[PDB]
Amino acid sequence: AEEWYFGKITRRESERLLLNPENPRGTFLVRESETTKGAYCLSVSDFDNAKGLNVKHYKIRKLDSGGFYITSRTQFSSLQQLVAYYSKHADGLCHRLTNVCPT
């Protein structure tokens, strides 16, 4: 569902975009991995009371068969299904996916 997929942007630009102080906790985007070619990344804003704003990066791996997973426990047939699942369930992530990242 497009909006949350920022394609080939870098960890550093995703962090520029996510560290925007206006963004609520759980604001996210999906991008391609720089380090692991053929893999994706789920980038999500978070907050620590003492330290403030920070970004968690989760590698989305792709099986040869076609599926996607952050943890092999929960596999998905598409990235849109992975985003819809973690919007409702944190299930291992730092926080549930709330906002789509701006611009």
């Binding site: 990344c41 968690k56 990066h57 989760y58 590698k59 952050i70 943890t71 092999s72 426990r73 291992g92 992530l93 730092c94």
Partner: peptide
């Protein structure tokens, strides 16, 4: 990247 599960 973080460790999960």
């Amino acid at each position: 990247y973080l460790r999960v599960a």
